[PDB]
Design a protein around this ligand. Sequence first.
Ligand SMILES: Cc1cc(C)[n+](CCc2ccc(S(N)(=O)=O)cc2)c(C)c1
Ligand SMILES: [Zn+2]
Length: 258
Amino acid sequence: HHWGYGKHNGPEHWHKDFPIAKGERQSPVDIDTHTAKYDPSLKPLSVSYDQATSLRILNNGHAFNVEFDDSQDKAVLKGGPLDGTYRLIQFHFHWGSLDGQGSEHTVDKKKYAAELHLVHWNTKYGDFGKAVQQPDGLAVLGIFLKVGSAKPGLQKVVDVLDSIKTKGKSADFTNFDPRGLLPESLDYWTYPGSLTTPPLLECVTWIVLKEPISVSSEQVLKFRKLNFNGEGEPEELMVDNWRPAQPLKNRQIKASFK
Ligand SMILES: Cc1cc(C)[n+](CCc2ccc(S(N)(=O)=O)cc2)c(C)c1
Ligand SMILES: [Zn+2]
């Protein structure tokens, strides 16, 4: 049995198979807004998802992935603290069993109901595989979810979860526009970190948006109906698949605004 989010295989156990879990630039982290400093050397962030092409949605037993075709330059993240172009490969979420928790990054210790992660890899490294062998191989755009009014652009994702309840299942999911998941403002905090799940590789430049999106109680409730287990296995609701905030150590979180 591999890593999970339970008492016997959760976050506090990961360091055993993945020692870097105790590394120098692990994620997530708490964002102390008062300590974060405005950085004028940051260029305007550029998110271009106009040509994005989704392919499939998958339940990997830890969350669900909406995968995109990254064989060409379509859906790229540029500017900000990033040098060059990063290509969108997939997006997934982290959520809790209750609205009071679920996000990985926290704001002044405040936990949101969930957190969306749009994953991109640095195109100068050929592909994802090579990218994860570099300190600047990845860029993840994090967006917080709070419970309130529904998010229209997230519904198509919500309605397909029925077809991928258990680990291993996947369903076709073309023509999904990730632009319908972004808040109005692109203000953000940024810092060098890592993947928040094993292998927990420290190759990520995190870009976390200040403004969160609102989703309905009904929508997040469906996220919670998913399973960690595979078909025909005792049911284990897919909830609280988030890693707690890790030590900041020698890092500074910069703000794109004021
Ligand atoms: C080929 C390939 C193999 C793997 C394991 N992955 C997923 C890796 C991964 C793991 C966790 C985060 S997260 N939670 O956003 O830090 C982002 C990417 C991708 C995107 C492509
Ligand atoms: Zn994630």
